[PDB]
Swiss-Prot record:
The lineage of its organism: Bacteria, Pseudomonadati, Pseudomonadota, Betaproteobacteria, Burkholderiales. Optimum pH is 9 for PET film hydrolysis. Optimum pH is 9 for PET (commercial drinking bottle) hydrolysis. Optimum pH is 6.5-8.0 for BHET hydrolysis. Optimum pH is 8.0 for the hydrolysis of pNP-esters. The enzyme is active at pH 6-10, has an optimal pH range of 7-9 and it is rapidly inactivated below pH 7.0 or above pH 9.0. It comes from the Bacteria. Salts and glycerol enhance the enzymatic activity in vitro towards pNP-esters, while detergents and organic solvents reduce the enzymatic activity. Changing W132F: Increases activity towards 1-naphthyl butyrate. The keyword Signal applies. It comes from Piscinibacter sakaiensis (Ideonella sakaiensis). GO terms for molecular function: acetylesterase activity; carboxylic ester hydrolase activity. This is Poly(ethylene terephthalate) hydrolase.
Amino acid sequence: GANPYARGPNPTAASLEASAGPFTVRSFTVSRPSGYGAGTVYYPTNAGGTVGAIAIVPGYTARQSSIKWWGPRLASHGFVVITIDTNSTLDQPESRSSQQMAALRQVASLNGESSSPIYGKVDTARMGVMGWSMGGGGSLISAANNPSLKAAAPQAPWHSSTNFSSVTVPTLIFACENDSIAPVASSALPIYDSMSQNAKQFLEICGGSHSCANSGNSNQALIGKKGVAWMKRFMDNDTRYSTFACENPNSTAVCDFRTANCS
């Protein structure tokens, strides 16, 4: 019958393009980070049920600031979101993936800690991974190693290998057309093309620098719609979001769009 994981009102373009979803958001600093440098947890105060958890990792040299805007944007649509700082700003993708999974583990721990603001708010069986550049490569390694993850949505990803043919997790890749750090043609697009077994999507922002999906970007309506739609469709099995998740947004800001096995 009814999808037990469906949360919130039926979506519209307007509701997904808005700065905030329907739920009220609060946040806290993780008091004793377990396996990573630091974290901020964003959560809805008024979802009508337990929600999935998403862990988000920055790029090389970067901090939570670069990725922070996802915390409220996703949590306001019914997710617990942890943004991390890595143990070192100079950690590489494999380390970033371990730390991302350690952050998801700690959100699972906090869900069982009666003093935590997220006590009983998380469905620890439903998790997703996001991140920028080496933190995006780390997200893809997390998905490859942990195929029970329900969705991945890295941005301007990079890894030392572009072969993610093992990934069976639904994966949306955000890319930035004018990326000079991890050029689309040598990084994000090969990574996308490698993935044969999954629902997948490629969305490249016109004229975007390497930071085109970071906090402060000028395309939050489109990028936030797609990220929330992908996570709703695949972490919540919420087919109300199937068309938003799978469609070509046919948008001025989109300079490359691909998708496969999307429903």
